[PDB]
Amino acid sequence: SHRKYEAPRHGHLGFLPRKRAASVRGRVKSFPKDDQTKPVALTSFLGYKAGMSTIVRDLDRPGSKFHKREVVEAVTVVDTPPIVVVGVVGYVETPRGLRSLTTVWAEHLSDEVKRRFYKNWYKSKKKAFTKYSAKYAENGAQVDRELARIKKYASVVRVLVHTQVRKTPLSQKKAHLAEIQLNGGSVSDKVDWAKEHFEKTVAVDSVFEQNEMIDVVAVTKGHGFEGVTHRWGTKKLPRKTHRGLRKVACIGAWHPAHVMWSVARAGQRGYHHRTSINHKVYRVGKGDDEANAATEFDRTKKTITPMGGFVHYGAINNDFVILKGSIPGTRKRVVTLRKSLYTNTSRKALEEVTLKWIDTASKFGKGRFQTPAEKHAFLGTLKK
RNA sequence: UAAAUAUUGGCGAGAGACCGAUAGCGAACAAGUACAGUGAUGGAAAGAUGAAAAGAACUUUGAAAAGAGAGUGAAAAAGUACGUGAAAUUGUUGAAAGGGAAGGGCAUUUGAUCAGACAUGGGCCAGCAUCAGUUUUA
RNA sequence: GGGUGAAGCCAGAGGAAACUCUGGUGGAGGCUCGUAGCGGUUCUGACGUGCAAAUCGAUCGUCGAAUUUGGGUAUAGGGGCGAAAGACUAAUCGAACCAUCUAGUAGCUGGUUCCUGCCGAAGUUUCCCUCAGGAUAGCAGAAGCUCGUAUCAGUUUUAUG
RNA sequence: GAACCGAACGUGGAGUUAAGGUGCCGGAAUACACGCUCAUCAGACACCACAAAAGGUGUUAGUUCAUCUAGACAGCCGGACGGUGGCCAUGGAAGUCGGAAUCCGCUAAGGAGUGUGUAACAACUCACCGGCCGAAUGAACUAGCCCUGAAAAUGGAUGGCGCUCAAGCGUGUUACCUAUACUCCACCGUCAGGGUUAAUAUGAUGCCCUGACGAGUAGGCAGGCGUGGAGGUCAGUGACGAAGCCUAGGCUGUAAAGCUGGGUAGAACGGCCUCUAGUGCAGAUCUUGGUGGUAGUAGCAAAUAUUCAAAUGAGAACUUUGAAGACUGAAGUGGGGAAAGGUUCCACGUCAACAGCAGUUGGACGUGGGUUAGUCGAUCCUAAGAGAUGGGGAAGCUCC
């Protein structure tokens, strides 16, 4: 017999399967579509999620009821120390997809990167990239052959990149290696850029600009096993139920005499790899500056980090990015910011933003005061 | 009122084309016993070391049980968990195969293993030629 | 351990009288709220190869009498007892249990132990408190006896119904 | 695929066909010859797993009738009146609301008129005939293959892949594949018809010759294999090793089975002629006894609670002593009895089993010790009841 009351199904099918996923890093599965007319630039970046904070700003939607008004918003702060290039990879077009031709590396690798190749660093002899470093004692015999090989063949040229994790407050030491594709003019100009940029550092100001849309990529919250009702979002069974009432009652129906793939079951929740789209940037601050949050309306000398600090993280003494809304991931986690694939004329992404005020109260609790100078003005001076 | 006639009980003697310890009486053994039921009643399992206990003195490892040696005897592959010691079922070693079961029948190949008249003085496996019987193809 | 406060007594107020009101005292009832005690409503909760062949929890009914219970004594199977449900009568009840007659009877179910060789069926006719069954003929095997090309044939032809 | 088509079967060898097939899976012509079909849902082989009425200028063949030396159809222009508004009908009917007449002229041809249109005319348009052009066209029907008609539930089935002058549909002509069928030979058994000890060794039940046949449940008869005992007989076998048991050793028989090498073991047991029976097992929710997978899994969670050192001991989460925390809270986890059990009380020794973990502890196990009454109970009296005697029943056990 038929259903009776036809309602929409629980959960999205496309997001199956639901595993742990191997990597903790985001991993960009596709980059933008390239243009040989435009100049050379990086398509992506690496950072760390610090926390969240409120923001008040203007509004210029001629049409809405809140035209030229103060509007409170949600925001996510991202710690982004300077990037360090240390490699080049050639990729050749074949009938069976792309194929890696040759990897090249620089002379002087740091101990942040070299830790990644070992599991037991303290016990090891630290022998990595020693015999490769001897190849650079020939001016550039074996170097410029393989760079000219990548110049002749291959239509795509990516760059190996790692994060600086001695500057950040994390107890990590290890770096995070990652490929970032170069989308620019020609193949020859990509490799000329790459050899000059060995060891050389890269900032965030070169990659991203203010008032721009970004795609975010990172791994979600932990949780673990979880049942049916919270994982999928099914209805509770009545109170008067023998043997459980937080389940699906009927799985399927015999003939077909099997359990269907579409049925909601118990199994792993969280820690999944998701890529979010359209997140507008409000600020691209700098580490070498007192008064980061000093807007033109406010003008009070205070750093972006609140009273006490960011909870389960610490502080920020480097460049950072204020993204609108939420970001998929926990704190202390790696996140890869990607440029948009399609240029919007949507009117949201086009409006020019100017921040009016940023909050810096102790989010570890319910803080009233923003800075210690304000606190000593309200109460004092007893008795310490 | 004896005799010729009866007799799955009792006391005493003979026999068998009868059973051979899941048989034969319920009972070959401390069996109407152990045990169950308020009670009338119900009611099992359990035979075999060796000719002779000669039933393993003495050393050494272990807290001890036992173990390794030694010793008794024709034999301990007879040690009082005892003549012989099958199958289900298990451990070790050796040989072989294994992409949603294995296990069979016909025919080969390879690997293993095994019967069968060349011994006297010092049979098995094929090839060609001319014939017979049955066929096929120019 | 509380609540309610019936008869019976004592004192006052009103009234011309007949009598009528108010205050104490007293402690009635198959009354009433509730502990131990005795029961077993609902959760159709727990457990459901259990702690348990009927228990566990919370919620509930009744709680000074048609009450609850020990020891002794009476009633025994077509009998006993029953404020009556065919209830209870030693986990056994629309007729208990123990032995014997008893290896009760069954047109009904299930099983029925070694090889090759030769022949090879039937589910149809008549009768039956016959229709899941028997008798009777038909079909089958075995043993053969009297004879040795016979007066035969699931067939044809000529003549004729 | 129980039943359809072809064929009925002892064991093997060689040839040849039946029904059905020959792109590949699959052994065998990607043979030969003449047509038809192209499907945005093609079709594909009896019983058999479906399709109809009704339709198509999709294409192929055919039947009956017509016009043709300008076809005539085209297909673009020219005409479409004169008598005439014909009689009638009635507001008005003039070819065109209708009822009947249906005739002439000029004629190349023009109906007393095919419709449009108007109150009725007017105006347009056909029927019929020319003008341009130069060889086949027009109507009505019949059946072939294709298409529309043709909508069901998990993903799906000419057997599948795939096939388009086919590997499809209809028809013809040859080769080739192949059944336990047919022909011929070898061997087995059964049945029939003969011939022969006329001394002439060994079974007259013998020893030969010739011919046909062979499927089979229920059922019947025949000839053999094995098990336990009884009578006879091989002056059978055996402590120099009988019976039993084990064996990817061997030999014989179609088979039931039998004989024999190697190992183990330690007292009896075989063949041939006959007698006799508690004489052969895979099934019975069979009977008794033993052992598996499941599985080192289910589980050992209710009565609030344990901790630190010291001692004994081979060994201590659990025994004994100390210290600290706790609970029952006097309708009690306190102190005594009744029924019921019967040494469980108590000491010394001591852990193979039992105390669903452990154990030096124990209501366990081994060996002993322990209950003292004139006054506390029983004994004595009677209760609801039970029950002899004298008597009377009943064949009587016994009943009142």
Added chain:
RNA sequence: GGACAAGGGGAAUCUGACUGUCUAAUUAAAACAUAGCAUUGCGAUGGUCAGAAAGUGAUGUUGACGCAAUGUGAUUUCUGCCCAGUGCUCUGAAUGUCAAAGUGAAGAAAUUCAACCAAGCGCGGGUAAACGGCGGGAGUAACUAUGACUCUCUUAAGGUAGCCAAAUGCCUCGUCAUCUAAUUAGUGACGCGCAUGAAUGGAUUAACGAGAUUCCCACUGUCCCUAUCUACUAUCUAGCGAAACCACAGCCAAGGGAACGGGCUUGGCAGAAUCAGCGGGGAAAGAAGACCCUGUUGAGCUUGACUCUAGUUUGACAUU
């Protein structure tokens, strides 16, 4: 009442008055009991009841304000009509019927055919707080329903007071009114009511109910819509260590087939060993279907089924 302890309340309808009692382990009720009411039998040589029998018993250490046998079920209020049928009962009239023993006649006797005849049945009377029935079926008409006369069918009588789509109404979710935004429900009226109705008790009703049913107030995770916390499990380890079940085993689609394959046929396919969960399959386990039919198989209960019987009652003979 700072912990602990401790009633939710209101307006109705059906039903039994109340306290009480039962299906031990699925039914606690509207069932049973009850006070009250009524009926029947009995004066001891008696009623009711036991026993195989007795010089034997229970009621009864009794005597009608008692013992025995039934119905109804407190109070208020009423209990209408019908003795044809079926029971029960009688100082009813008899001779319609009617046993053995005895009486008579016939016969050689066995026998035979006659009258005579006890109770009990038939015939007559009584009885419904005995079992039961109290229906309708036809018609006549005043006026446009009129409820006064006739008969008579199943026998005798034809539903009186009362109450209702009621736990009793098939047609139905009756029609009208009310409660709601909306009501197959609830309550109030209507009644030719398939098939209501008077101690087989009718109508009403204060208190009481772990009884059934509808609505209103307060209250809330029942619900919109789920979220979080705590202990004890599960989970992992040390030790100890089972049962159910089991032909053989365990991947799908279609086909045909005992008409719904895990094994046959044609395709899809296919990679050691394993751990938490879970309830789609294994037509998953539980029990020789209890429903249904068959059997010439049974048992429990009932009765003008067939054949008997203890007890009791009438008559004859003996005791005499």
Added chain:
RNA sequence: UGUCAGGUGGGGAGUUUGGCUGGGGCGGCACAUCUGUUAAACGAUAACGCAGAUGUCCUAAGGGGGACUCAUGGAGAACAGAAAUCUCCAGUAGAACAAAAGGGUAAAAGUCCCCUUGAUUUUGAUUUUCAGUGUGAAUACAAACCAUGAAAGUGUGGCC
């Protein structure tokens, strides 16, 4: 009190409470028989297939012999009429024969008139259903004894 006889006696005892059947039960009879058909041109042949019958009536409606023609139509005769009785012509059965249906029959097997008891006795053989048993019915003789007719004959119940 004892023995025998008559009534009462579900208080108690024992036993039965058909079959077929598009499940059973309620209906119906297909359960002993008969006619036509289904039934497929010898016989045989099914269903709760179709249309219908029987559990009797008859001393004459049995048996024999002799007379004579019926249905219906047409033409004529007072009351008399579509229909009473009377007469002639045509008349192969279109009538009648105890009942269901089919077959059979014309100087008759129909209708009327004369005489009677073959609806009698003794026993076997034989067809049909069929086991080639019984039951029922039916057919053909032998030995008798009668009826009827001038006789030949016919008759052992109802034309089959």
Added chain:
RNA sequence: AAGCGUUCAUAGCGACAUUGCUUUUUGAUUCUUCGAUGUCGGCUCUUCCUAUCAUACCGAAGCAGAAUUCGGUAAGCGUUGGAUUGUUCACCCACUAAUAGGGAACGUGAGCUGGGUUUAGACCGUCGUGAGACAGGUUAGUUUUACCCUACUGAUGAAUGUUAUCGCAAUAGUAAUUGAACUUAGUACGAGAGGAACAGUUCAUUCGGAUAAUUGGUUUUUGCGGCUGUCUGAUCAGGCAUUGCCGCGAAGCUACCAUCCGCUGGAUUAUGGCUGAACGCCUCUAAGUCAGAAUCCAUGCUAGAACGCGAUGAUUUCUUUGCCUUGCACAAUAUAGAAGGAUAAGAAUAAGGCGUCUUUUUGGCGUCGCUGAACCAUAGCAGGCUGGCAACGGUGCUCUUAGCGGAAAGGCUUUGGGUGCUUGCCGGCGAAUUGCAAUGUCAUUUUGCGCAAGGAUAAAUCAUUUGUAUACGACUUAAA
């Protein structure tokens, strides 16, 4: 297709006849199951069908516009909240874009519920003399077991030299959904009444994936503070009341009860068109071709074949006893199957190749194909041992100079040197006996054995630790 529809058979309808399809109604039948397949509905959850109620894009009208009616390709996407009834069905009150119909053992009971039917208790009416009956009404009545195999949802993992980083993408899955307002405009259209649409702005509905700055919830933070009863002689400071109770309450977890985010290209269907035969015209079609829808396919997102691959990093002692690269012999082990040679134009097929001239091009003039029965290699003991004649070529083995080849390049030409053989043409010695045939053994893989040259001199697990993770593994960190 007789009539209806003012006129007019077919806009929409359609009598009298007649062919079908379907198994969501109910009968007919009794093949499967009676040593049991748990029988009514509701709750919960998944997927399939189209005979389409809505939404996308079109055709027809008795379509002026608005509303509605009939049909086409379409199952992509959605289809509700309540009163009464045990109900399926039914009937109402609203909302809505719309409140379409069905299947899956009449889906779904080791998933729940037990109101219904359906046992025993009991009551009422009709029927029966009576026990009892009633497809009449009424009330109270027991819902057992997964620890096994497959299935699904997550999680480890032996083995391809060992270990570690960074990637490609075969295949499988896939998602967005519908409305309201402002403007267009009170404009088109219409006598009026009424009353559109495309583009352009802002917001909502249902659904999905993350997230915790704020608001709300949770409180064993037993963090602070308050209050009862009792116990420690009093005060201070605490125990117990199975978390004693009460108020506020960080951290974490969480809510359309809180905030953010949810893409743009190509090829088609219906349908409407262009050029244009068949059929001298006409025609959207026969050949060819332009636009086109919630359809399909990519882009993007999710997993990553544990028997699909690639690139890069480091590769173990001196007890010697072992590692890698290249040549010796020795030795086992096998080979879906060597036995002269896998011998390189591209495009057309109602057309091409090769050679040679020239208004260098879709150009002239000749010639070949009709099968590879080809073309290159080919005579010597499985190919011996030595001579000359004639060329100055052909080849094998080594070594070097150059370059080309990334799709899986692991191979192709190429200068030169050195060193053999040479059947281009003539000479001189040798072979027997394997006894008349018996594949008569002449390949090519792996492999670890000892040699003797050249070369280099490590990691991962366990234990410990951490929380961005966590049933247990695993994952993420740290540590001379």
